[PDB]
Every structure is written in C-alpha cells, then in structure tokens.
C-alpha cells in the first residue's frame, strides 16, 4: 500500500551549536559528592549539530537525537545496513498505547510513513527473530542517545519542558539509561518515521566520538556538572 510521493521532502539541512547537551550516565554505579573521570563515546561540547526542518543518514559509532516535539508527530525509527530482506533489520515504533520493537527481514518501500485513517510500511515480514513490547517512550524537548556495542543496543532518553523558541537551550541535564537489547546487528544507517496523514518536521542529529570527560556527583548521586578535557587548555 506504500507508494512514492510527489513533492520532495527536502528539509533544510542547517547547522547549529551543541553547547553542553548530550551527557548520559555511563554505568549503574552510585557515587556521592565526588569527581570521576571516564573515557567513553560522547558528543563534544560546542559541536556542530545538524538541523532538519526524510533522508537516510549514517549511524557511525552512535547517534544523538533531539526533537522539539509538539503533539507527538515523530513515531519511530528504522535501523539496518541493506534495508531489505537480505539482512536483519530493526524497527521501533511508539504508537498511541505502547512501544513495539521488532527484528526481522522486512521489505520496506522507498518512502516510509506510519499513516492514519497498524504497521503497513513493509510489504513482507519474514524470518522474525526478536519481538518486544513495553510502555511508551514519549512543546517538549525529547533527547535520545542510541549506541550499539558488541551485540548490545543501548537507548538513553530524557524529556524536558522548555519555553525557548528555536535552538537548544543553555543548561545541563544528564540522560538516564532507558532500554537495552541483547541482539547482535551491524547497523550502519537509520531512518526516521513520521505519521503524516495524506493531505515540516524539525529535529537535530549529532554524532559521537571517543574522549574523556570529568563528571561531578552531588550528595544524592545525580550528575550536575561536567568538563570536556579535550578542549581549551583551561579545561585540560
């Protein structure tokens, strides 16, 4: 039932500044009022993050995703390498009630969209291996971090109430771990899912690099401040 559209969804690929966003808890250890230095994959401070106002983008080591969501327009994500039945493909969709995660050799069309009048963006669903159902993920800022290391898919998330107009605010907010998948795939590209009825989508995408950070833990074990060591000499 999937057909190509007429107009090209050429969202303007602008650039903007990351500031101090994209910090997540690296493990499940409790620390109280202490400074801890750790080396891992992070988003560099004051980086160049791409802004879209639905192309295929590379995955690289990890992905930082941000949405200035108004009334839940974004719905899901697709992951894979060949994006067909030749190789395993991953699908995540947050519908009105639950979240569904599937790992199958789907047969996607050339333009995915959820549609409203559940899943009909794939002609076939063969050799399904992993299935998962859980509670929903989602004028709000929705921040997500996706990583894939040694057969494990890590998803971190955070929600923020913001009143600023366009760009990312100046502040600090650590990202808590959300979901782990014990599945081994070699994803290299990914795609975004919109439930656009047949009748304008702003989000931000950034990449990750390995580096060292310094984190401060308060009395209650919450990360309140961080320092990027690979920056101006004062930070070092």
Partner 1 sequence: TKCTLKSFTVEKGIYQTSNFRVQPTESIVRFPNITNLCPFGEVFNATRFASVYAWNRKRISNCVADYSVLYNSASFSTFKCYGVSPTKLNDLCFTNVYADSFVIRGDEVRQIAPGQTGKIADYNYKLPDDFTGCVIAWNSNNLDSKVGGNYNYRYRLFRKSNLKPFERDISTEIYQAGSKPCNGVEGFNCYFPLQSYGFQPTNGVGYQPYRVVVLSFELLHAPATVCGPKKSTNLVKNKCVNFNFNGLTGTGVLTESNKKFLPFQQFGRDIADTTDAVRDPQTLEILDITPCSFGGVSVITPGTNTSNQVAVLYQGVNCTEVPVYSTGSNVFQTRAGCLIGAEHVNNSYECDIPIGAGICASYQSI
Ligand X SMILES: *[C@@H]1O[C@H](CO)[C@@H](O[C@@H]2O[C@H](CO)[C@@H](O)[C@H](O)[C@H]2NC(C)=O)[C@H](O)[C@H]1NC(C)=O
Contacts with ligand NAG, residue ranges (CB under 6 A): 15, 17, 48, 184-186
Residue 174: enclosing H or E segment and its boundaries? Answer: strand 174-181
Asked if 135 is part of the footprint of ligand X (rule: CB under 6 A), the reply reads no
Positions in 31-70 near partner 1 (CB under 8 A): 31-32, 34
For residue 129, state whether it binds ligand X (rule: CB under 6 A): yes
* 221 and 31 Cβ atoms separated by less than 8 Å: yes
Query: In this chain, which of 11, 183, 196, 227 binds partner 1, going by CB under 8 A?
Result: 183
Measured over the CA atoms of residue 117, residue 122, residue 123 and residue 128, the dihedral's sign is negative
Per CB under 6 A, the list member of 100, 109, 178, 205 interacting with ligand X is 100
Of 160 and 186, the one with the shorter C-beta distance to partner 1 is 186
Longest dimension (CA), the chain: 58
Both tokens of residue 36?
């801890």
Residue 48 binding target from ligand X, partner 1, ligand NAG, none, CB below 5 to 8 Å by type: ligand NAG
Q: How far apart are CA 188 and CA 179, in angstroms?
A: 20
CB atoms near residue 159 (< 10 Å): 13
Q: Nearer to ligand X by C-beta: 42 or 217?
A: 217
Binding partner of residue 232 among ligand X, partner 1, ligand NAG, none, CB cut-off 5 to 8 Å per kind? none
Give whichever of 9 and 17 is closer to ligand NAG, judged by the CB atom: 17
Q: Residue 100 or 205: which CB sits closer to partner 1?
A: 100
C-alpha distances (whole Å) from 45 to each of 16, 31, 48, 203 are 12, 24, 9, 19
Q: Per CB under 8 A, does 134 bind partner 1?
A: no
């Amino acid at each position: 039932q999937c057909v190509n559209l007429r107009t090209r969804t050429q969202l303007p690929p602008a650039y903007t500044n990351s500031f101090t966003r994209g910090v997540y808890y690296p493990d499940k250890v409790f620390r109280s009022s202490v400074l801890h230095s750790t080396q891992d994959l992070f988003l560099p401070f004051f980086s160049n993050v791409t802004w879209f106002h639905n192309p295929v983008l590379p995955f690289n080591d990890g992905v930082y995703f941000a949405s200035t969501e108004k009334s839940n327009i974004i719905r899901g994500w697709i992951f894979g390498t060949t994006l067909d039945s030749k190789t395993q493909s991953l699908l995540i969709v947050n519908n009105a009630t639950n979240v569904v995660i599937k790992v199958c050799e789907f047969q996607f069309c050339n333009d995915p969209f959820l549609d409203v009048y559940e899943s009909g963006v794939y002609s076939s669903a063969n050799n399904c291996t992993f299935e998962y159902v859980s509670q929903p993920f989602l004028k709000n800022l929705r921040e997500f971090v996706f990583k894939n290391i040694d057969g494990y898919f890590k998803i971190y998330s955070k929600h923020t109430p913001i009143n600023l107009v366009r760009d990312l605010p100046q502040g600090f907010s650590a990202l808590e771990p959300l979901v782990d998948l014990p599945i081994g795939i070699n994803i290299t590209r990914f795609q975004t899912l919109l439930a656009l009825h047949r009748s304008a989508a702003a989000y931000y995408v950034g990449y990750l690099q390995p580096r060292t950070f310094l984190l401060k833990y308060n009395e209650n074990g919450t990360i309140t401040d961080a320092v990027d060591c690979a920056l101006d000499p004062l930070s070092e």
